[PDB]
């Protein structure tokens, strides 16, 4: 039951916490713990209010619950779920969990399953618009991934002006024209796949303010190829990055390809438990994938 909430019913706890600072706050409403995401500019408010119905229909195991929305001030009220942002699991403070290729592929598959649900909704698709590890949450000992924030429709001017911190994942057609489409979420997904496999921050070698990243990828820069990555994976990855959005897979294609490939990645249900000690080397290890692949096909 998605509701139209009165802001008076909200008691805000702290502005500092796990979510996007200055957009997302942890608060309480009714008796429940919630996350309040304020919708900032007028362009974003217009696009957000129009799609409240679709949001009220969202229900999926890889998306946090959405309790409702407020219309003054415009904001989305969602479930505050316990866990760690995928960003901090990957790149956070130095005592970090160890994870395997199976986990990497399982997280990306789950991401695609939630986004495919979004894209397939009828009559009108819901486009996520801002897929990135800060907006994904790991729960159940790091084995289940959930989308915990939704993107907004930002005007062209704003990309170089109000760093929302999405530059490394932003499709070039979003930078130049704010052409949010299914293919923009697919581009972000391809970047995230590179990021979890290498455990590296995309476009980290580009200093300057955030917008230098968006100019780099708009000029065609991409993350480096990954040493010894399975060619089915590399093909999916680089097709996702394409400048031409039509040359990019759909989210349903991605779900099916990745579901297939999970047969070569057993053990994704093992909880995270241990700490851990040109082209780029992968963080994860594909040796088991190659062995299992040959068991299926020979050399």
Count of domains for the chain: 2
Kind and range of the H or E run holding 295: helix 287-297
Per the annotation, binding residues for ATP are 16-24, 37
CA dihedral 138, 163, 93, 98 (to 10 degrees): 40
Technique employed here was: X-ray
C-alpha 196/C-alpha 166 separation (Å) is 16
Helices (H), ranges, the chain: 42-50, 52-56, 86-91, 101-120, 156-159, 172-177, 182-198, 211-218, 231-240, 251-261, 287-297
Same domain for 129 and 70: no
Same domain for 188 and 122: yes
Same domain for 165 and 35: no
Contact yes or no for 140/271 (Cβ under 8 A): yes
C-alpha 94/C-alpha 14 separation (Å) is 25
Q: Domain limits at 32?
A: 3-79
State the catalytic residues.
130
Same domain for 161 and 33: no
Same domain for 128 and 9: no
C-alpha 222/C-alpha 191 separation (Å) is 9
DSSP 226: B
Same domain for 282 and 260: yes
Same domain for 58 and 134: no
Kind and range of the H or E run holding 253: helix 251-261
Same domain for 60 and 136: no
C-alpha 18/C-alpha 85 separation (Å) is 7
Q: Retrieve residue 257's tokens.
A: 């390809």
DSSP 63: B
Same domain for 257 and 228: yes
Among 79, 105, 128, the domain boundary falls at 79
Torsion over CA: 57, 62, 67, 73 (sign) = negative
50: domain CATH number is: 3.30.200.20
Helix axes 101-120, 251-261, angle to 10 degrees: 150
Among 30, 58, 79, the domain boundary falls at 79
| Angle subtended at Cα 267 by Cα 266 and Cα 272, rounded to the nearest 5 degrees | 150
Contact yes or no for 279/226 (Cβ under 8 A): yes
Count of residues for the chain? 299
Same domain for 106 and 65: no
Among 45, 60, 79, the domain boundary falls at 79
In angstroms, this model's resolution equals 2.0
227: domain CATH number is: 1.10.510.10
Same domain for 19 and 109: no
For 58, how many CA atoms within 13 A lie in the half-sphere containing its CB?
Answer: 32
Same domain for 123 and 48: no
Helix axes 182-198, 101-120, angle to 10 degrees: 170
Residue written as token pair 């996350």: 35
């Amino acid at each position: 039951n998605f509701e139209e909430i009165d802001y008076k019913e909200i008691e805000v706890e702290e502005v500092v916490g796990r979510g996007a600072f200055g957009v997302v706050c942890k608060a309480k409403w009714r008796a429940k713990d919630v996350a309040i995401k304020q919708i900032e500019s007028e362009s974003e408010r217009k696009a957000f209010i129009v799609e409240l119905r679709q949001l009220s229909r969202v229900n999926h195991p890889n998306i946090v619950k959405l309790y409702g929305a407020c219309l003054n001030p415009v904001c989305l009220v969602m479930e505050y779920a316990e866990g760690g942002s995928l960003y901090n699991v990957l790149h956070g403070a130095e005592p970090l969990p160890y994870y395997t290729a199976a986990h990497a592929m399982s997280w990306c598959l789950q991401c695609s399953q939630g986004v495919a649900y979004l894209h397939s909704m009828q009559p009108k698709a819901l486009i996520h618009r801002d897929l990135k590890p800060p907006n994904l949450l790991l729960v159940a000992g790091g084995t289940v991934l959930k989308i915990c924030d939704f993107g907004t429709a930002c005007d062209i001017q704003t990309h170089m002006t109000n760093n929302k911190g999405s530059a490394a994942w932003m499709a070039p057609e979003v930078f130049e024209g704010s052409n949010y489409s299914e293919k923009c979420d697919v581009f972000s997904w391809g970047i995230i796949l590179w990021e979890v496999i290498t455990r590296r921050k995309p476009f980290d070698e580009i200093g300057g303010p955030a917008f230098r990243i968006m100019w780099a990828v708009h000029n065609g820069t991409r993350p480096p190829l990954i040493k010894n990555l399975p060619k089915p994976i590399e093909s999916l990855m680089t097709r996702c990055w394409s400048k031409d959005p039509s040359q990019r897979p759909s989210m349903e294609e991605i779900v099916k390809i990745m579901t297939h490939l999970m047969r070569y990645f057993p053990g994704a249900d093992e909880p995270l438990q241990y700490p851990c000690q040109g082209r780029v080397e992968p963080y994860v290890d594909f040796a088991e994938f190659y062995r299992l692949w040959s068991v299926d096909h020979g050399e």
